[PDB]
């Protein structure tokens, strides 16, 4: 939502997505048509198949395109933390590919329904339905790599802690030997283990406590090594963006 994103439903790969939508069409529509029926019955049969497959793909895409957060419509701190964790151009480009594939599926649906309006036989209508479903399948097969990337980023972003940028906040900072994590273990309750090697905490953790009947946060820091401006990894980028963005103590 605003502070936490454990509400994106799920995404699937391209092959499993194709299996889901096409088997759903085959199960939930009727499958028995005859050459001796009327041509309006035959056209309505194949038109229903085309429309149902298109709407299933559009619904599966539209669930994702509203599930994933807008990177340019959130807080600056959350935007910078998400930008460090996963690359912003890869993020925007993958969701743009999802949106374009959605619009192309609606185009295929409309054009082939209009072409099914004038079919004269079961053979002709069957070839038209097969061509429409094959074009949709080719689009979804071209969507392979953004779906795998989006699956990884959803699985990672679900676990992420909930920092309110506009509340009472104690930030801790220092060199890579424990210090800070042991102090957070003392003042709060958490799971940040204390260990004598340097980069034990490769992320940032939140604890909560109560002083004078107010609720305080306390954010732990991985550690900034020694480096000037552009030699740093995303691990140190997390800490310096937390300090740069969190109006805290």
């Amino acid at each position: 939502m605003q502070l936490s994103w454990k509400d994106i439903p799920t995404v699937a790969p391209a092959n499993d997505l194709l299996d889901i939508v096409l088997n759903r069409t085959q199960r939930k529509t009727p499958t028995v048509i005859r050459p001796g029926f009327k041509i309006t019955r035959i056209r309505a049969f194949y038109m229903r198949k085309v429309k149902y497959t298109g709407e299933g793909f559009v619904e599966k895409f539209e669930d994702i395109l509203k599930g994933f957060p807008n990177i340019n419509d959130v807080h600056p701190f959350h935007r910078d933390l998400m930008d460090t964790l996963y690359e912003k151009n890869h993020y925007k480009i993958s969701l743009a590919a999802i949106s374009r594939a959605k619009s192309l599926v609606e185009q295929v649906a409309r054009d082939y329904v209009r072409l099914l309006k004038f079919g004269q036989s079961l053979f002709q209508c069957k070839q038209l339905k097969r061509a429409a479903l094959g074009r949709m399948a080719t689009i979804v097969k071209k969507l392979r790599d953004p779906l795998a990337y989006l699956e990884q980023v959803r699985q990672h972003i679900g676990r992420l802690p909930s920092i309110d940028p506009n509340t009472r906040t104690l930030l801790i900072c220092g060199y890579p030997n424990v210090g800070k994590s042991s102090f957070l273990r003392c003042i709060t309750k958490s799971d940040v283990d204390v260990q004598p090697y340097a980069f034990t905490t490769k992320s940032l953790y939140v604890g909560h406590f109560d002083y004078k009947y107010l609720r305080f946060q306390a954010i732990d820091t991985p550690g900034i090594l020694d480096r000037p401006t552009e030699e740093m990894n995303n691990i140190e980028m997390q800490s310096i963006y937390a300090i740069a963005h969190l109006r805290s103590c």
Binding site: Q26, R159, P161, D191, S203, Y205
Partner: protein, 72 residues
């Protein structure tokens, strides 16, 4: 729970006591189980299973040929 916590619980507490033997027995039963699904499944699921089996067999023989040719 914060940043990735299931593997921290695994490192702090352990897995189940009967965890490893169950996985070994599952992998041992899978050989009998894939032939039971080739003979019991009917309809469309049988055709889908046969397509997946053909794809897996071609992929495995391609891996064997490519490995022996590249190493030798």
């Amino acid at each position: 729970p914060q940043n990735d916590y299931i593997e921290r619980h695994i490192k702090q507490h352990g897995k189940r006591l009967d965890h490893e033997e169950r996985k070994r027995k599952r992998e041992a039963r899978e050989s009998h189980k894939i032939s039971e699904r080739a003979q019991k499944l009917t309809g469309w699921k049988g055709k889908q299973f046969a397509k997946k089996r053909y794809a897996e067999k071609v992929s495995m023989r391609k891996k064997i040929k490519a490995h022996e040719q590249s190493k030798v």
